[PDB]
Design a protein around this ligand. Structure first.
Ligand SMILES: Nc1nc(=O)c2ncn([C@@H]3O[C@@H]4COP(=O)(O)O[C@H]5[C@@H](O)[C@H](n6cnc7c(N)ncnc76)O[C@@H]5COP(=O)(O)O[C@@H]3[C@@H]4O)c2[nH]1
Lengths: 180, 179
């Protein structure tokens, strides 16, 4: 997970965080100032420690609704001309009402950990996977301390699903951060 | 081991099944540029010292960008229409175009390089070479069990000769196209 965390910084957050606010301003110009709130001008990244990462947020929560993409960012990377980095804007509902708008996505390496843990060859225990997911988050959190752009450009949302019958709403969790 | 799985799961598993279709479309738009069977695979560069320049022409001027394949869009981890893109290069020999292929570096190696230069990472130069070797070996293993979508990629693993001459990238790439 140490390698995965450094990879997520070096290969993604390092590249995308410095240009984010510029892309937000452009989005606001094209889309009637939709992301004008201070709570809306951050990349919110979901870290499900259980590592269940769907490709569509509607698979896990009906209240997280795709609206539009930010302008794409093109960067020449490792031989690939104009490799494209993209981010998606979601509206978060609360009892049918549009309660917040944000840029949202999952931390992609957690999807890798899931698939890897369950493979016949390279697999490892669920408990090892949870250890690794936590070690991934902690290592990324450590890395981002030397990165000043981190503080105002992203929000790390780390959580586990309950298995005891207690309520947890992902939409509610995102909204709580937006509203703060 | 972890980086190799990320590279398979998060990339090669996603793009290899769709590659031939993109190659057909590319050929329809660019005069069968990728006509030879040697030109119909993704060639991926694996420098064992983990040096990954972002621009291939800067490290070997006999390798020159021509065009991109059509983009592939996939919904990924909350990103709608995440974009996957590949680049086509011509390779010169004795100063004249002698081959054309889809070429790139294995991006995770650049992470290993960068880690070896940042003290926070606790990651030595020896650590780097070991992990680079392990990364390549692990990936070859993965691709065995995915026999389909072989014919779709070739791995070019290389290092500088121990007490030999500078390794020619363009010549290594032609050797693989022609093999
Ligand atoms: N060569 C190439 N072109 C691609 O489009 C591409 N997409 C992914 N990859 C490489 O595949 C492997 C896994 O990618 P994944 O997405 O899981 O994790 C990626 C992913 O979480 C993230 N990342 C990179 N690009 C994006 C992106 N565009 N959107 C979200 N995450 C990204 O940061 C991790 C490290 O990135 P790279 O170091 O480039 O290497 C990746 C990786 O080793 C690609 N490689």
């Amino acid at each position: 997970a140490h390698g995965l965390a450094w990879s997520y910084y070096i290969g993604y957050l390092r590249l995308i965080l410095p240009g984010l606010q510029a892309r937000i301003r452009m989005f606001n110009q094209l889309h009637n100032n939709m992301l004008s709130g201070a709570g809306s001008r951050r990349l919110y990244i979901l870290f499900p420690l259980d590592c269940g990462v769907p490709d569509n947020l509607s698979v896990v929560d009906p209240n997280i609704r795709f609206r539009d993409m930010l302008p794409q960012q093109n960067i020449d990377r490792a031989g690939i001309k104009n490799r494209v980095y993209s981010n998606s804007v979601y509206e978060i509902l609360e009892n049918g009402q549009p309660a917040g708008v944000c840029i949202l996505e999952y931390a992609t390496p957690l999807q890798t950990l899931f698939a890897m843990s369950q493979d016949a060859k390279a697999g490892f225990s669920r408990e090892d996977r949870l250890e690794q997911a936590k070690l991934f988050c902690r290592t990324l959190e450590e890395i981002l301390e030397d990165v000043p752009e981190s503080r105002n450009n992203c929000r790390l949302i780390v959580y586990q699903e309950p298995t005891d019958g207690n309520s947890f709403s992902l939409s509610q969790e995102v909204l709580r951060h937006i509203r703060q």
